[PDB]
Design a binder for this molecule. Structure first.
Ligand SMILES: [Br-]
Ligand SMILES: [Br-]
Ligand SMILES: [Br-]
Ligand SMILES: [Br-]
Ligand SMILES: [Br-]
Lengths: 418, 418
């Protein structure tokens, strides 16, 4: 009967290990998770096969700990252009096992016992347990909509700037931002970025920018990197993911980039966690970046076409969710959509003596009864703020159109025509 | 300039980086890599290619979390027979990013502030920093040879039992064992296994058994798993690696198996560290196990054939090293060989990191002067015990016959057959 006082409390199973099992069990239409239902860019897949089949015996053995040279070079080339600076491929970038381990290396490497970390709700669920495991003290601020009538935009979900500055103090070590945002799809504009950038500069805090969905912003919006703001490069760490950039979530390769001084900490954590990442996968991703770097402005460039591909799907889902009676939040980016479901909202019917956040029971009930899987957004809120996400649900619309129609059908049937 | 990360060990002294840099700069005959310089079993490579090219779009998207179902099934099938226990593929097996992350999850999930962890020297690189990072207190004991019996075998490298028993007390949380040993290649016999087991039972300590080289024991000897000894299953966590099993060190996939009670701790760490591992690699490894499973008792089984392949190379290296005037420790398993160099010491040829350790000096000198690269075993000792490694060098003989030949010819040219 021992105890692991390393701040490894609760979190018995993450929402994913939980819901990934329900999907393996009731095998419904999987609108939960977060990945495409169809094949990723062929050039990327071909490149992995090419690495497996390479005549070079080094292609499937250990590569550099901090990242495959070909990949790191490619990464530098891309982000140097986007950041308007020459990022050193050897010291200002680190390759990791997805954006997950990038987040882990960052939080473990820059938050010590007592350090306060500000997290914006709803948040990608791993932020809080990561900070906790590091001995940090999370402080939460929720995003909230601007009066919801029916269909709104993720731009309508805003935090209270006065509440934000109040959380900043001499103990504040880090703030984590996620743009484009999961699960709302919100794209922070310049003013919103400046608000957190000013606070970071006044209080000397580290900004961690989770930008895995960087290429998935819908017109007329635009992704802005906070590390490009006036004095932010010196105090920002930016994270990306190959699984999101190339729609190959199964490859689990991500990266962090920023000043050599901040990145050193990440390197020490990484080195003593997994040491190195898969070589053939890193090579294939390097080839993929090299492929896109040649056509960065072309409409065939995957960094430019994914949003046009997704936009139609986004609009489709917003329409059938609204038609069924939900109040969807149309995302400015990404492939997630949060919607306010209705059935006990203002039509107090069924009860729940169980008392355990509605969005969890609704979402579960659905995949087990009607065979449509969504995920409960309360899973992305601190314990005392969970209630904020109980009337919602998150759905992924990165699916083949036949499957999107399928969802619309099961929802229309679940309801009634007339 | 940023100082230490934050109460963390800046393991920039990680030997691999400076030795990788050395090899690039002098391009010697490299006996320091730790992986083959030729290709792994074609079925495995072909399996990866097939996964990249799979008609199933989910082949390259997120898989389970605790491990790809097709992999954990195969893992349980193999090890269940090996330990003569039905291992639950879902709760008693955990897939990780190499044996490295398996070690990380085990030490992070079972070592808390103040916990003592005994480490056997020479130790695999990551054992000390991982323990320190977890707030634990390492307690070191070296394996020392018996040089007074003609030639030397890794079996002659032994622990002082009195010293070992004295190291265990109620504060001992964990003991890490590595069999076959890196880099001695020592294979713990049943009696040595019993010494550790009895200690573990007497003081209620968790035994972490690093068995990555489990399939590479040379015929005279046999790999025995401590988790099979009386009362040990309930207190052992055993780790392996696909990189070492299939000679695909760039694939970075490993596992831990043992009671669900012990694995639970690992799961909590893993899920908030990397969450999940590469799907196409895990698929390729699953088919690799499936392939071998079908011929486990046949001599063409890679689990059975690797030792014969390596044994010839081992004998070849032991011979030419003795030729030059070194005294090699012939390993019982694995593909590393430690040898005592009694050649020119820090007298004329040496003059490098003089301050530092002589085995660094010697190894760097031979790379620059002779064009033959080995690794300094001093790197794998605690500071107070480093002197025990200064007389030695680590070579890897998992190399093309022609390169082994070239190494032999370089040493001969350096020397002089009388
Ligand atoms: Br668009
Ligand atoms: Br700056
Ligand atoms: Br074959
Ligand atoms: Br043999
Ligand atoms: Br054996």
């Amino acid at each position: 009967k021992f105890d692991l006082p390393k701040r490894y409390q609760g979190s018995t199973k993450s929402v994913w290990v939980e819901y990934i099992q329900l999907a393996a069990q009731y095998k419904p239409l999987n609108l939960g998770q977060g990945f495409p239902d169809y094949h990723a860019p062929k050039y990327a897949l071909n490149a992995l096969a090419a690495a497996a089949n390479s005549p070079d015996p080094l292609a499937n053995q250990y590569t550099r700990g901090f990242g495959h040279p070909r990949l790191v070079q490619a990464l530098s080339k891309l982000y140097s252009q986007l950041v308007d600076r020459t990022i050193n491929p050897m010291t200002e970038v680190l390759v990791t096992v997805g954006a997950y381990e990038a987040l882990y290396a960052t939080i473990q490497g820059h938050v010590d016992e007592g350090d306060e970390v500000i997290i914006i709700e709803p948040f990608f669920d791993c932020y809080e347990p990561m900070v906790k495991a590091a001995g940090g003290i999370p402080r939460f601020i929720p995003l909230k909509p601007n009066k919801t009538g029916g269909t709104i935009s993720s731009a309508d979900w805003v935090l209270d700037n006065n509440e934000l500055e109040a959380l900043f103090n001499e103990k504040t070590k880090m703030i984590i931002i996620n743009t484009p945002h999961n699960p709302l799809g919100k794209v922070m504009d310049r003013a919103e970025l400046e608000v957190v950038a000013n606070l970071c500069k006044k209080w000397n805090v580290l900004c961690v920018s989770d930008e895995v969905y960087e290429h998935m912003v819908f017109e007329p919006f635009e992704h802005i990197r906070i590390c490009t703001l006036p004095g932010m490069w010196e105090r920002t760490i930016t994270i990306g993911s190959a699984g999101k950039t190339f729609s190959l979530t199964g490859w689990k390769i991500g990266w962090a980039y920023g000043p050599e001084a901040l990145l050193k900490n990440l390197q020490m954590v990484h080195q003593n966690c997994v040491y190195t990442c898969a070589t053939p996968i890193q090579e294939a991703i390097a080839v993929g970046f090299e492929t896109e770097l040649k056509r960065l402005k072309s409409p065939e460039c995957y960094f430019n076409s994914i949003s046009g591909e997704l936009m139609a799907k986004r609009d489709y889902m917003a329409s059938f969710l609204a038609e069924v009676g939900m109040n969807p939040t149309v995302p400015q980016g990404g492939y997630f959509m949060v919607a306010d479901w209705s059935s006990l909202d203002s039509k107090v019917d069924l009860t729940q003596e169980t008392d355990a956040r509605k969005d969890y029971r609704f979402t579960k009930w659905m995949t087990k009864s009607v065979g449509l899987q969504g995920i409960p957004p309360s899973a992305f809120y601190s314990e005392p703020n969970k209630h904020l996400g109980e009337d919602f649900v998150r759905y992924c619309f990165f699916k083949k159109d036949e499957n999107l129609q399928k969802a619309a059908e099961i929802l229309r049937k679940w309801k009634g025509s007339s």
